[PDB]
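Obj.: predict assembly geometry.
Materials: sequence records (below).
Method: joint structure prediction, all chains together.
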Amino acid sequence: GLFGAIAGFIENGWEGMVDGWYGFRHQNAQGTGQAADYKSTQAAIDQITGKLNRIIKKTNTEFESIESEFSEIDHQIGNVINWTKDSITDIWTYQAELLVAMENQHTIDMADSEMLNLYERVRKQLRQNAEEDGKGCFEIYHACDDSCMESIRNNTYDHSQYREEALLNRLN
Amino acid sequence: GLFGAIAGFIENGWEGMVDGWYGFRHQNAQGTGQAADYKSTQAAIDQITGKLNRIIKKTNTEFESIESEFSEIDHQIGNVINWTKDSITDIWTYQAELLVAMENQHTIDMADSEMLNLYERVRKQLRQNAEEDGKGCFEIYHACDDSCMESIRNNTYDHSQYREEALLNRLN
Amino acid sequence: GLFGAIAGFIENGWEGMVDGWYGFRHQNAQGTGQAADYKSTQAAIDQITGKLNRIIKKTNTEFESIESEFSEIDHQIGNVINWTKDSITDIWTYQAELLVAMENQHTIDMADSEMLNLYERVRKQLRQNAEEDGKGCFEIYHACDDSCMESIRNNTYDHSQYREEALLNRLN
Amino acid sequence: DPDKICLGHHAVANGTIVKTLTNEQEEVTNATETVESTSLNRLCMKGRNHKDLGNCHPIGMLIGTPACDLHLTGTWDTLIERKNAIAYCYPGATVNEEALRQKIMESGGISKINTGFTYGSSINSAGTTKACMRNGGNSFYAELKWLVSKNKGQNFPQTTNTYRNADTAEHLIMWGIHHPSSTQEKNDLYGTQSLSISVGSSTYKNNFVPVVGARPQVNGLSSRIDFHWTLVQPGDKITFSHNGGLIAPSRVSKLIGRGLGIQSEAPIDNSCESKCFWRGGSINTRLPFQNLSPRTVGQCPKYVNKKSLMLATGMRNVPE
Amino acid sequence: DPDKICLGHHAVANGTIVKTLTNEQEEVTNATETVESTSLNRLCMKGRNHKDLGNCHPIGMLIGTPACDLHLTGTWDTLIERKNAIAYCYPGATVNEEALRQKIMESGGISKINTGFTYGSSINSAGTTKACMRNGGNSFYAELKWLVSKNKGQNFPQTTNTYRNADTAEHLIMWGIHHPSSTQEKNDLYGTQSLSISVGSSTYKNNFVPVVGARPQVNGLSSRIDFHWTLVQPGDKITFSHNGGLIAPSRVSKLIGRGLGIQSEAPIDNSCESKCFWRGGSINTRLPFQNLSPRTVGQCPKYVNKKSLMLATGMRNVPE
Amino acid sequence: DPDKICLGHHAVANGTIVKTLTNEQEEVTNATETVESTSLNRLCMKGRNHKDLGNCHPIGMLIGTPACDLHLTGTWDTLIERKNAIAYCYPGATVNEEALRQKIMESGGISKINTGFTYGSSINSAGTTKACMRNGGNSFYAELKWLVSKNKGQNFPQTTNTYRNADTAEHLIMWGIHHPSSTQEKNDLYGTQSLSISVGSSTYKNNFVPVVGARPQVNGLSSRIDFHWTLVQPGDKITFSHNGGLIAPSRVSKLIGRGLGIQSEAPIDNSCESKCFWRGGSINTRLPFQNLSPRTVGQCPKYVNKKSLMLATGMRNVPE
Ligand SMILES: *[C@@H]1O[C@H](CO)[C@@H](O[C@@H]2O[C@H](CO)[C@@H](O)[C@H](O)[C@H]2NC(C)=O)[C@H](O)[C@H]1NC(C)=O
Ligand SMILES: *[C@@H]1O[C@H](CO)[C@@H](O[C@@H]2O[C@H](CO)[C@@H](O)[C@H](O)[C@H]2NC(C)=O)[C@H](O)[C@H]1NC(C)=O
Ligand SMILES: *[C@@H]1O[C@H](CO)[C@@H](O[C@@H]2O[C@H](CO)[C@@H](O)[C@H](O)[C@H]2NC(C)=O)[C@H](O)[C@H]1NC(C)=O
Ligand SMILES: *[C@@H]1O[C@H](CO)[C@@H](O)[C@H](O)[C@H]1NC(C)=O
Ligand SMILES: *[C@@H]1O[C@H](CO)[C@@H](O)[C@H](O)[C@H]1NC(C)=O
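Observations (raw structure tokens):
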């Protein structure tokens, strides 16, 4: 996809993550955990809500009958009306197909971008204390307990504290 | 947004930058400075100019009157004309709304991409001599005077010149 | 462009790469290498094939004559038909122009994204064993023979095998 | 050896297929329909002063067919016409029929104004027929008097009847012309004299002569009564000069304001509300498109030649 | 302490709100309008060989109403019709009036060609009326002749006149039928005989009878002159057979090429140019859309049901 | 010093220019046309039971002009009308001509049914003319009869002819009115009496009077026969009352099912198939748009006001 995360360097989604669209799984000395990310999830949902608000509607134009259900109308004007209505149908059928195809492309790529923006925020946060494994994970080169893992998820992780330890382990 | 820079990892814009759309702020021993980036600014402006050239236009189709301003036309043909004209208005209103909604999304995301492309260009230039602070800034781990800062902006900064000093300061 | 790679940090295309859309050139002691990347190439071709399948078609709507080629129709209904047909032609001309402009923008940017995604995949594979030159190349700081180069292309390169050698050359 | 934090996104066991610009079979976590396939088999008339004509055809309201006796006048914002509805009890048709029907179904009511037509002793203004019945006896169109001469064979006298439009709005006047089955029938009802009917206003001048010719038995009758209509402008007068064959108007009509005309087979429901109607009933969907019918009236989703069109409401579904 | 280079983008104090696919209220640094809301309250006629008809109705140009004396012939690329313009100095109407008006307003000019019709010594062919004043004297339609009996009460002589179209292009011919206000008027002008008017060509056949009737007083007259028109194909002959009541053509019209018909209330301005006109004036906007009127002629922005649609011309505004 | 791996993309020697949202002149590796500019100067009739009328005009099929002798009946899914096709050997025209032409060109065939009309001993029903020649002999429309007085100058007798539609489907009946060149011609054929033709069914009432008048000599005749038509509904009777001037039908027509009407100058080709036709031939393109003509029939690409619209099928072309 456009941003290379969803159906990209992230191998697959987590069916187990029922409390969000994006989030984190961790492994440290204490064990493993999973948590959803609220801000990224809500950013994707809000943008999709915006589309539904714009798309799920009709015009307030009041149309009246120009065709009889139960009787014959003039043949020649009937031919003009048939040509016109079929021309309008072809336009709306085409417009509908293009709208949904275009919107669907954008929805999928927008969702991809939100996954990458979270990945990128965490990368810049960890600075020189972690390395990418190419699978959507960061290998952290210091002891990072449950409170440390929370600081990363909460966007409050301070790289400066762990830098000396991380660089020693990275360079051996 | 899509590229994560404007209204993303860049906290906010600079109201003081009046000579360009994208640019640099630096801090060294000699003090602080600001300069617009011409190439990123011109890339964004040229693309918006292209949209305006395409969009700010009417057709050269010469339409003649099929409705009288001052007299009655045949009621039956009037009903067909009313149905047709209202159908055409609903189409153009829809097309106008979709055009501007789609172009606005793309214009905002294109401007975001040009901000990220300038950031990425500087990242690769600085190579191992600087680190990302996650706010759109690079911490440069050597003395970088006004000439050095200009070389980063001018795309003529040679990383190899400062590499030894930089790695020593980064690793310590 | 949106993803900054094609007509971006990659100076120009390779006319000599006739077996793929994206790929690798390398240099080591053993020799000079070139190879197309199948996966990225087929992703771009398949997405463009998707567009052609969507766009290269007509409606199955059966239209009959409402204008005589060889005789006069009623002048008043003729005026209505002229107005309607010209209105329909303005809509299809506009929709045709917008479709191709939008699809062409997306095709170019999609192709750019597939280049960047291949580049990003390589960056993550090489980890701390290589540095970006800013021109779409990676300078590899260990002996990387034809099997090593193949392993990068085939996504089987193990960074840990070469890490000690690489860090020694990078830091001293 | 080193600790790890992994970034990911959700997936679902059962994803949904949507179309994109590039992919005809793209699986996403969720999608929603944009084309309405379903309708209510009922006319949702809540908040509308509506009139259900039933067996009464709109044209029957103006000439006053027995079937239309309850719909000769009134006001409405919505008028509902049904299939097989009756206009003509006596066999025949209106000239420019569809134009009249559309005008009635465009209206927000019908007012009736007396022509004030009164006839000499030589004329009986109560001619009746087996084809048009009410109260278990031969009758006629309520809004027109069938003018007959007293003596079989005796000439219907040269009569003049003028309607003056004293109103500030145009009035719709209708009249019938008899077309005998046999040369005997023509001479029987209106005498041997060569019959002529002239209708004259400032804006309308026309001449009618009963064409003698045997038509097929319809409602047990071989002859025909064909209807004609025009508008009388404010302050203008319309004159009927005739000597037999004219079915003369007793009242003229005024169409009041505007309303929404609906042709539907679906029964009335006053409990539910709608802005969109078709032959099969009411469309209350919030979706932008519908595939029920290209023939709708009111504020409606646009008709499309599509069964389904799914809008993605989630990311790519990449299951485990 | 490391030295620092920071990358950023501009912002403005007061940004503009635009709509995107995902956001109803997206603030950007700059935007521009796509829907034109303003019109010039003038008809911009620079670069146009235009004719402003003023109080001359297009139909008046063909029959020659005094109000149209300056508009009987000429060439134009633009013809401007005004509200309440005069066609009929003598009271009456044209059959198929709107069709005729449309044809004139599509034209790029009018030529006039003599019929060459002459009348016997017992016909006065210069019947005039106070209703049609010209040069401070009783006159008539310039392109028609009111034919009456020279001797009051005498039978109008049977007359046959033929116009042949000698041209390679179709001509437009008009005639009137006089409908007297009383039997005394009919007898005085045409005699006591029964009146009959036949009009025949290859492409047109019709028969007319003067209907005597006192119509409402319009321009002081209870009588009417009603007009009929047809096209005469190249080489064809149209024949008028009449014995009283024909208002005969002295000239026929040729509509020359094509022009833009405008119906407007806006004054002419020869100092500004335009390609787009409506009732209220000229639209010279470069914008693709307009919300002034769905009724426009020329090369126009498309009408939309929108006050405003702002197109972003800058990035997201993220102020300090 | 260090080994190097470089990522790149292909380029081509000859790129193609396309338009994007932002760039009028974008060079890409490849593009494909979306607008068809080329047509086959051929009517592709493979898989079609087609009738090429050649010199025969559709209306000529119903009345039986000599040019149409091999097209009086038939079945087809495609009917091809040619430029300058002949309807009328005797000079004249049909009232409501275009409506009749379109109705034939919508049909899937024609059946002919005898009227069974007979005429009194004082009527010559075998009227012929040099204008309607067959095999070097004077003839007439195959489907009609020119009724004249057997004795030159004698009054044509008062005659009544009735056709009953015995079928379950509507029949198309046509008749002519003869408009003599002079009074002498009229008198010679029909006598000095006042001529009147009445036509009456359930769904059609009209009256015709022959109009005496010289028209331009066409096919050696200054007289005219003008045609009228109506649909006779199943079971209905249509009656002709006439005393001279009626051109009476020998047969009525039945239009069978539906077919595609094509007006084209392009020759038939049985080797190629098509669903889209215009004046200049067949459009077999798979492309969504065409700029050949806004006038097409069948399943067609949409007409656009563009020579070319190139869809990119490749990335930006960036040569060294
Ligand atoms: C306009 O289109 C309608 C619908 O396509 C046509 O109505 C159909 O006519 C056919 C006869 O060929 C019937 O079999 C169908 O039952 C009709 N369908 C409906 C929904 O009414 C109609 O014939 C066309 N109008 C004209 C003037 O040709
Ligand atoms: C076509 O639509 C126009 C505009 O809606 C109708 O004209 C209006 O008619 C109403 C009567 O209900 C008047 O009060 C308005 O003043 C009219 N507006 C204008 C701008 O003319 C018109 O009636 C419709 N045509 C038909 C045949 O119904
Ligand atoms: C409808 O538009 C067509 C095409 O513009 C008109 O036909 C043209 O009329 C001009 C008269 O100046 C001729 O010179 C062209 O040769 C015609 N072109 C074609 C393709 O027919 C037509 O006149 C318009 N219809 C009405 C009723 O005005
Ligand atoms: C590497 O990839 C290429 C291209 O798909 C493939 O042909 C080859 O077999 C692979 N090489 C090895 C040694 O697996
Ligand atoms: C803002 O408004 C328009 C473009 O939308 C233009 O006239 C003006 O120069 C713009 N000013 C800027 C970008 O500062």
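Conclusions so far: Chain F touches chain C through 69 residues (CB under 8 Å).
To do: check interface contacts against the pulldown list.
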